[PDB]
């Protein structure tokens, strides 16, 4: 339960560190830098997926082309 409250630091801290930050410039600079950060991560994994799905799918293609 110590962590339950340890993340209650990180949540409320982040909540008001942003809230007390300039709501004109940051509202655009943060959101962009959050949105892109996530998007660049999601894209990373989806690459990692498609990386293998290519490989394994290319394995089969070799198979068919051989005889």
């Amino acid at each position: 339960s110590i962590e339950q409250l340890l993340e209650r630091q990180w949540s409320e801290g982040q909540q008001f560190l942003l809230e007390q930050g300039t709501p004109s410039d940051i509202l655009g600079m943060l959101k962009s830098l959050h949105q892109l950060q996530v998007e660049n991560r999601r894209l990373e994994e989806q690459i990692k997926n498609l990386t293998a799905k290519k490989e394994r799918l290319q394995l089969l293609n070799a198979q068919l082309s051989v005889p």
């Binding site: 892109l36 950060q37 989806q46 498609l50 990386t51």
Partner: protein, 67 residues
């Protein structure tokens, strides 16, 4: 005991809060986002090739199996 701690948190709070709002705000954020958007553009690249290739692979598999 906590008095020595929670006040030292509040020391750092304004120390960085209204401080880097001014001259080290668009020095870091706008440089960060710069390489970020560059990375995003990079990622969009690979993820394209991979999906576009896994369009070509799965198309040639339809052919080679029916053939």
């Amino acid at each position: 005991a906590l008095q020595k701690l929670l006040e030292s948190f509040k020391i750092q709070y304004l120390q960085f809060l209204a401080y880097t709002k001014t001259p080290q705000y668009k020095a870091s954020l706008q440089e960060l986002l710069g390489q970020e958007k560059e990375k995003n553009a990079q990622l969009l690249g690979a993820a394209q090739q991979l999906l576009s290739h896994c369009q070509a692979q799965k198309e040639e598999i339809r052919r080679l199996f029916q053939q």
